[PDB]
């Protein structure tokens, strides 16, 4: 049953790896590996920024910027189409400032793992 009890925490997390052999080499992350993370991250951030600059109230700010649905078994397919808003009416009919308390969903526990008498008379 020993497996179940403190199942998460385990010894080898407390012990440092380089103390066995110094000079055990942690490689810096090559080159063509960073040219990847840089690519995907760059694209993602562009998606956020362009996603924002087309939101807000400036016909000015937009100059600095697919059926796609197989529903269920795809039987009925679909075609998805945006609707042009009456420019006067509010775009985003449902955007309204409201405050929300989010829950904190804790799936697992992160063990907090660390390694007076006369002292109080000092402190």
């Amino acid at each position: 049953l020993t497996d179940q009890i403190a199942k998460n925490v385990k010894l080898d997390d407390f012990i440092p790896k380089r103390q066995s052999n110094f000079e055990l080499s942690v490689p810096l992350p090559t080159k063509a590996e960073i040219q990847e993370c840089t690519a995907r991250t760059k694209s993602y951030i562009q998606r956020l920024v362009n996603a924002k600059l087309a939101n807000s109230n400036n016909r000015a700010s937009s100059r600095y910027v697919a059926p796609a649905n197989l529903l269920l078994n795809n039987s009925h397919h679909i075609e998805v189409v945006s609707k042009q808003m009456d420019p006067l009416l509010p775009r985003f009919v449902g955007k309204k400032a409201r405050k929300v308390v989010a829950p904190t969903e804790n799936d697992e526990v992160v063990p907090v793992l660390h390694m007076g008498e006369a002292d109080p008379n000092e402190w």
Partner: protein, 37 residues
């Protein structure tokens, strides 16, 4: 009923819905970066 004892976590403000008011200082300015050699 006085002083801070804490600060406000930005986490809270992260979950709210945006208003979309347009401020004066976020109007586009210095719109082009500069790269070194």
């Amino acid at each position: 009923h006085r002083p801070q004892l804490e600060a406000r976590s930005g986490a809270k403000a992260a979950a709210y819905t945006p208003t979309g008011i347009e401020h004066a200082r976020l109007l586009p300015g210095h719109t082009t970066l500069k790269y070194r050699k």
